[PDB]
Amino acid sequence: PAEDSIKVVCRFRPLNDSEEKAGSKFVVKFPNNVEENCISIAGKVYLFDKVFKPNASQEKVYNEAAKSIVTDVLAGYNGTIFAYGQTSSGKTHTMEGVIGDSVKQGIIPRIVNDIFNHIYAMEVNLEFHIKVSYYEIYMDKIRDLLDVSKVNLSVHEDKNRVPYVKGATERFVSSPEDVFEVIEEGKSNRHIAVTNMNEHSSRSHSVFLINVKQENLENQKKLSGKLYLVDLAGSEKINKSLSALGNVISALADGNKTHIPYRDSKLTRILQESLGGNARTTIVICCSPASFNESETKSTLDFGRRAKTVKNVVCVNEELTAEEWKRR
Amino acid sequence: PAEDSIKVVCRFRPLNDSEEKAGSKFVVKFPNNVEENCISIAGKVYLFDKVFKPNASQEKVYNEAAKSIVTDVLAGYNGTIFAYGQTSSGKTHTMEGVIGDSVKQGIIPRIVNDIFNHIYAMEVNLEFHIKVSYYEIYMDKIRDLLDVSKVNLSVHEDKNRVPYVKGATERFVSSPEDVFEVIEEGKSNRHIAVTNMNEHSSRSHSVFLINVKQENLENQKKLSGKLYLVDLAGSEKINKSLSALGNVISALADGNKTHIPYRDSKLTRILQESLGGNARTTIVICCSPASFNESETKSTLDFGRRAKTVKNVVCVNEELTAEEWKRR
């Protein structure tokens, strides 16, 4: 009813030059006539909410993995998309892609443009308040990417109740241009004290948060929805927060333990609602098709298959003004 | 207590070339040792909240007529300043001056810069929502200066209750630069269908509205204050809305009539709160010192002397969230 499976979508990228050079074969198949929902490796078939082949465009991935999320956030649901997989499998290409390229822009910039296109096309007399945060998690410590003096931030939980990173910048935005400025500022700050971004980004989690509140000016109905967009550290062997993420999924998936270890990492505390709580969650598992990476691919697929059995329980986040509470 | 006299401040400009050319004398005196609060003409002394001589700078006028208003609006009071006087007496120079000139910028741009300087210097964890409207009233009809298709707008009164111009643009601003862009857009639109601005601006009322809401993030206290900044049509003989403005002041000043004719014009309906209601109001009466204009100067002074006896009753405009109403 309000009961919502975590969606899991699987994306294979093309075999690349280091793979071919090392003599890798393409070891994965895609059964046809089954809605593009299947992938087979070494004889074993997995079923996901969507499987994307190496040729799938960014627009196709967006239209299937992500689009519904902007419509949901604009209706007052929390939304979360994260990308998971071994380093070099395609997580950043999926989550960010090449910003500003019409073909190769990833999920985040498309989501940003779509939020504002939808708002501009609404007739209803609505007022939107949008703010974004952008931070990194590395070795279980949080660095604010929009304010270099805010390092080692803490995770807290608010009134009613819901976690938050206390002290994290919250930047108001009112056009897609304002958002992309914020993203550029974040990316640039991420380079402070980092000698090799390729290696450092492969070992830390990049968290982009869009908080969208709305007030309906005709009936005073207030709705809010948080959109978490996360590019995770590589899943290869085994980042301590990723162990925690797997233990969380494993516990919710077994469903037979009183204690879900959300507190085992700041990442899983921040994603607590996304993992078995009040958000519509999509995980993009990213995979190489190369024989060389087959065992890592199989762990990725097995992670996604377990997550796909977790159930979230979601509702519209409605707040009441006075008139409801007033009249009582 | 909450009982607040309409402040009246009187500003004389220098004798100008057309005045000297026509053989005007300087016919006004300023008694010293009485706090600069007096002006005498033909033997008759008037007392105001401040009198400014022809040499008074824009900064001096602002520091006395206006500054307190930004502090008030930021504390949740409504604030209104209007300029009144015969064409060529100094109303536009007072209200707007030369925008961008550090010496000659008038009350509006100083108010704009000050609002944002105060916000930036607050420590309290506060969130401000600021929107501006800019419209003209000509022959008792309202034209929106920020949206050329919105002509002939109506005056309505809201829930709790308070008038408003229905349909008037409301532009969100979040820096002084955004405000001055809006002002430039307004000024430029005002020229549509006007063949001579000097004559047309002398016969219409220019209304600049800054609406400032704030939410205190620690205690959920919500405050709001409207700032009306109005440059009126010339007071010479006798714009129908100015007759209405005088009849309103005359009625509140006599205090002995059940019916204050606020509805006699859209101007006095919009200013209803400013005239005997819930706002801190300052009127700048602007006057020429020239013998040639003496009879018009005396009407202006007599208007200001009557307005200065009107009492406003003001309070902080506090709104309650849920927690107050919730718990009951």
Binding site: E127, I130, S174, D178 | -
Partner: peptide, 12 residues
């Protein structure tokens, strides 16, 4: 702790 200015955006 700082005062912030929101940046709402309309439709209608």
């Amino acid at each position: 702790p700082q005062a912030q200015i929101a940046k709402p955006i309309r439709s209608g």
